[PDB]
Amino acid sequence: KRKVVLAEQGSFYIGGRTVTGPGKFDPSKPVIPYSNEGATFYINQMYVNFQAPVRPRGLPLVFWHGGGLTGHIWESTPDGRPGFQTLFVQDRHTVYTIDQPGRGRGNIPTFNGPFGQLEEESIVNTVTGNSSKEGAWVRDRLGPAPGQFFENSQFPRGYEDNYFKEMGFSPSISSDEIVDAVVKLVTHIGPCVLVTHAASGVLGMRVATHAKNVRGIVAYEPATSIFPKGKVPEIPPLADKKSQIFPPFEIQESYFKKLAKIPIQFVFGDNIPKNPKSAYWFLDWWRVTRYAHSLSLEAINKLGGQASLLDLPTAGLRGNTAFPFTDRNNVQVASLLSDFLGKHGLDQN
């Protein structure tokens, strides 16, 4: 089903701030090579793409890529099948896809000088970090080691080059500024649903606590758990006795309580072990991270919330990676998202 009918489509920039260099700009002086002298730079803005169907029904969806990714992951799968953008426009929702600040078409804040440095001010760090193909292979649970696939795999095998090419580094933009850009987008759109992934999971939870217009969250394989400040439960170290999961984010209770006012679903794929796995770090990391999320959702529910954990295997879908929305069964995964939206009337006007 590749055909799609759009009432309108487009893109725009939103959010960000400006920083300035010293001095004055003289238009009679050579403009190239570029100088910081008299310069204004727009930094930390976000790119937003939208596609609206004819006669939309229900709330617009905001798809928010995971760490080191872009909106591409919602456009197409690595093997070229339709992504969630097409599927949900066909499902009669207006769809927004973002490249957050620091990723893709979002701004990378750098100037004339060492990366990230504007004269004596460090806007972002010059030293970067970035996963390897091998790190991403195990992070995303294609298999326990690079080159290997779990038996039930839904990964589009043969398209590894396409898949890994979509990933890259993120400069050290503050998470506050990333959240700020999405809050501004939510203010612009009106009532909407956030659909997050991995690194954007915790960021979307934060956005919802700052933006009443977020009426629901579906988070695919969120990477960092969230708790009320001072109320982080005991979370065990990993099976190597030395590593820990990502430090849970803590927010004041008055903000955490806002998460109890909207439906929230966390979705996990397959091959997360039930028991400690010392031989495979990322598998064990996922075990304990999923556990921490279960406690986070329980925390939301004890405050009167509507938070749930959906393990795709319990719904009859086996072999999903940590990107279930680009796996070979992504249509079925989408069907479960449509089910969530319908249950809560988010597919109704």
Q: How many other C-beta atoms lie within 10 A of the C-beta of residue 224?
A: 22
Q: Which of 157, 180, 346 is nearest to 265 (CA)?
A: 346
By CB under 8 A, how many residues form the interface with its own copies?
Answer: 89
Name which of ligand R4O, its own copies, none residue 305 binds, using a CB cut-off of 5 to 8 Å depending on partner kind: none
Cα separation of 293 and 226, whole Å?
8
From its own copies, ligand R4O, none, interface partner of 243 (C-beta below 5 to 8 A by class) = its own copies
Task: Name which of residues 249 to 288 contact its own copies (CB under 8 A).
Answer: 278-282, 285
Query: Phi, psi (5° rounding) for residue 51?
Result: -135, 125
- Is residue 227 within the footprint of its own copies (CB under 8 A)? no
Min separation Cβ 236 and ligand R4O, Å: 18
Radius of gyration of the chain from its Cα atoms, rounded to whole angstroms: 21
The DSSP line for 214-229 is EEEEEEES-SS-EEET
Residue 60, C-beta contacts closer than 8 angstroms, at least 6 positions apart: 50, 93, 94, 95, 96, 189, 190, 192, 193
Map the footprint of ligand R4O across residues 308-347, applying CB under 6 A.
322
Q: Nearest-CA neighbor of 215 among 250, 253, 186, 244?
A: 186
Place of tokens 């990964």: 155
Dist CA 74 CA 63 (whole Å): 7
Q: Which of residues 131-160 bind ligand R4O (CB under 6 A)?
A: 139-140
Residue 302 φ then ψ, to 5° = -70, -20
Q: Cα separation of 137 and 164, whole Å?
A: 9
Q: Which does 27 bind (CB under 5 to 8 A by kind): ligand R4O, its own copies, none?
A: its own copies
Nearest Cα neighbor of 77 from 192, 155, 135 is: 155
Label residue 158 left, alpha or beta by phi (over 0 means left) and psi (-120 to 50 means alpha): left
Q: Considering CB under 6 A, how many residues would be counted as binding ligand R4O?
A: 18
C-beta of 86 vs 320, nearer to its own copies: 86
Query: What is the three-class DSSP state of 20?
Result: strand
- Nearest to ligand R4O of 129, 233 (CB atom): 129
Is 57 a binder of its own copies (CB under 8 A)?
no
Stretch of residues binding its own copies (CB under 8 A), selected from 138-146, 177-185, 199-207, 315-323: 138-146
Q: Tell me the window of 7-15, 206-214, 290-298, 326-334 that interacts with its own copies (CB under 8 A).
A: 7-15
- Smallest gap from Cβ 223 to ligand R4O, in A, equals 4
Is 17 a binding residue for its own copies by CB under 8 A? The answer is: no
Q: Residues 258-297: x/- map of binding to ligand R4O (CB under 6 A)?
A: ----------------------------------------
Integer Cα distance of 191 and 260 in angstroms: 17
CB 281 to ligand R4O: min, Å: 11
Tokens of 343: 């249950």
Residue 35 is a binding residue for ligand R4O (CB under 6 A) = no
- Return d(Cα 166, Cα 293) in angstroms, integer: 27
- Smallest separation, CB 6 to ligand R4O (Å): 28
Checking DSSP bridges between strand 192-197 and strand 61-64, what pairing results, if any?
Answer: parallel
Q: Where does this chain touch its own copies (CB under 8 A) — which range of 136-144, 229-237, 303-311, 332-340?
A: 136-144
Residues 73-112 that bind its own copies (CB under 8 A): 75-76, 78, 80, 82-83, 86, 99, 104-105, 107-108, 110-112
Q: Which pair of structure tokens corresponds to residue 335? A: 């069907």
Give, as ranges, the residues between 188 and 247 that touch ligand R4O (CB under 6 A): 198-199, 221, 223-224, 246
Considering only 60, 66, 144, 228, the residue that binds its own copies (CB under 8 A) is 144
**Residue 59 DSSP class:** -
Positions touching ligand R4O (CB under 6 A) are: 32-34, 66-69, 129, 139-140, 175, 198-199, 221, 223-224, 246, 322
